[PDB]
Amino acid sequence: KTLERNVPMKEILQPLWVVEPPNFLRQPVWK
Amino acid sequence: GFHFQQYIAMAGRAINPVQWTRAWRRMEGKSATEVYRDALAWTNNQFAQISRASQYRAWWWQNPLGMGLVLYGTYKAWHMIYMVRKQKKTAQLVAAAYGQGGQWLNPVPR
Amino acid sequence: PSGAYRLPAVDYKRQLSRGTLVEGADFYLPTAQEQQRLARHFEPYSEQEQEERRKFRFQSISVYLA
Ligand SMILES: CCCCCCCCCCCCCCCCCC(=O)OC[C@H](COP(=O)([O-])OCC(O)COP(=O)([O-])OC[C@@H](COC(=O)CCCCCCCCCCCCCCCCC)OC(=O)CCCCCCCCCCCCCCCCC)OC(=O)CCCCCCCCCCCCCCCCC
Ligand SMILES: CCCCCCCCCCCCCCCCCC(=O)OC[C@H](COP(=O)([O-])OCC(O)COP(=O)([O-])OC[C@@H](COC(=O)CCCCCCCCCCCCCCCCC)OC(=O)CCCCCCCCCCCCCCCCC)OC(=O)CCCCCCCCCCCCCCCCC
């Protein structure tokens, strides 16, 4: 069977989350 | 930094009233959380494109200071377009209300 | 004074002569669950704790903004 659907790139390449920084402690700021 | 031309084009579409009706129709069956998440995802996609593509690719504006010069130019453009315009208006306001330099006048002597 | 309300400590020189002084751990770990994490090697965190920690992989710029 042939491919006809228009495949977007978001289904393939997922971007990393960089807008809000990482929390290596995995704990909230008040804690 | 990248896609400044696309950003100008986005602003032009936003200021177009036909696009306001288009957005009105697109807002049917839609939530504020969804809109906010979409915008945040768009911004993240931009910054992630930068973080990834800077490792191997160089734009036409590449220079020994890198993207620092582009970001400085963005800041300077914003400053001269918005803040200096506001300063002009404030200057004319103060000059009509008190005279030139009226906001820095000394208190009335007692 | 009686001695009931005396100073609840001994000077560092006398401890050093007694062989008793400890210098370390500006910080501490209150709970044994938190103390034995690096020695367990197989469950440093329980499963419930793991899924609770997975909620804080990033800081919340939304909450910061609000
Ligand atoms: C006036 C300048 C001073 C501004 C005010 C003072 C502010 C000072 C602060 C400066 C801070 C700068 C901001 C830095 C942030 C980063 C911006 C950025 O790099 O991307 C810019 C952006 C490119 O974004 P991009 O993501 O890199 O996309 C590239 C494309 O894929 C296209 O791919 P490409 O490979 O085909 O081309 C890549 C690029 C290549 O660009 C270059 O390499 C430079 C071009 C030639 C080399 C020499 C450059 C300098 C002298 C010639 C150019 C004079 C204009 C000065 C332009 C400043 C930038 C060098 O092409 C351009 O971007 C065109 C730029 C030249 C526009 C010429 C317009 C002519 C009308 C103006 C009259 C003539 C000048 C009057 C005298 C002004 C003297 C100050 O350029 C645009 O403005 C987009 C234009 C879209 C068309 C809009 C409709 C036409 C209107 C034209 C005016 C455009 C607005 C700028 C006004 C300048 C003319 C008044
Ligand atoms: C004008 C300021 C007025 C106050 C003076 C300022 C004093 C504070 C200075 C702080 C300066 C720090 C610098 C900014 C931090 C930046 C980074 C950051 O915050 O990370 C993201 C971080 C997000 O946290 P996360 O790690 O993602 O955790 C998210 C969890 O998923 C969330 O889930 P969860 O499980 O954690 O809990 C959910 C929820 C709620 O928690 C729950 O689990 C449920 C329980 C909630 C119920 C009770 C609510 C709390 C108490 C009531 C609060 C409101 C009204 C009080 C009314 C009184 C009674 C009627 O969480 C919260 O509500 C978070 C608590 C927010 C408290 C702030 C964080 C503690 C910082 C220590 C500040 C020191 C103050 C001293 C304390 C007072 C004396 C002991 O942001 C924050 O949450 C904190 C907000 C920052 C406050 C805004 C202050 C402005 C900062 C200016 C900086 C820019 C400087 C230049 C200005 C010029 C610009 C052009």
SS3 sequence of C29-43 = CCCHHHHCHHHHCCC
Resolution (A): 2.9
Residue nearest atom 85 in ligand 1 by C-alpha distance = B5
Determination approach: cryo-EM
C60 and chain A: CB distance < 8 Å anywhere? yes
Fill in the DSSP letter of residue C58.
B
C62 and chain B: CB distance < 8 Å anywhere? yes
Contact list in A for residue B49 (CB cut-off 8 A) is 15
Q: Give the separation between CA A15 and CA B67, rounded to whole angstroms.
A: 21
Residue B48 near residue A15, CB atoms below 8 Å: yes
Rg (CA), chain C: 22
> Among all residues of chain A, which has the CA nearest to that of B37?
A19
Question: In terms of Cα–Cα distance, which of B14, C28, B52 is closest to A18?
Answer: B52
C59 and chain B: CB distance < 8 Å anywhere? no
Which of C53, C55, C58, C64 has most ligand 2 atoms within 8 Å of CB, for mutation?
A: C64
Residue C45 near residue C37, CB atoms below 8 Å: yes
What does the block give as tokens for A26?
Answer: 């995995």
Cβ contact, residue pair A15, B43, below 8 Å: no
SS3 assignment, position B26: helix
Contact list in A for residue B43 (CB cut-off 8 A) is 19
Question: In terms of Cα–Cα distance, which of C16, A14, A9 is closest to B48?
Answer: A14
Residue B74 CA, ligand 1 centroid: distance in Å: 13
- Residues near B106 by beta carbon (within 8 Å), at least 6 away in sequence: none
Residue B83's φ and ψ, nearest 5 degrees, are -75, -40
Residue A15 near residue B45, CB atoms below 8 Å: yes
Nearest by CB to C56, which of A17, A19, A23? A23
SS3 assignment, position C20: coil
What does the block give as tokens for B110?
Answer: 């007692």
Residue C61 near residue A20, CB atoms below 8 Å: yes
Contact list in C for residue A26 (CB cut-off 8 A) is 53-54, 56-57
Nearest by CB to C58, which of A23, A27, A29? A23
Q: In degrees, to the nearest 5, what angle opens at C-alpha B101 toward C-alphas B100 and B104?
A: 160
Question: In terms of Cα–Cα distance, which of B47, B44, B40, B82 is closest to B67?
Answer: B47
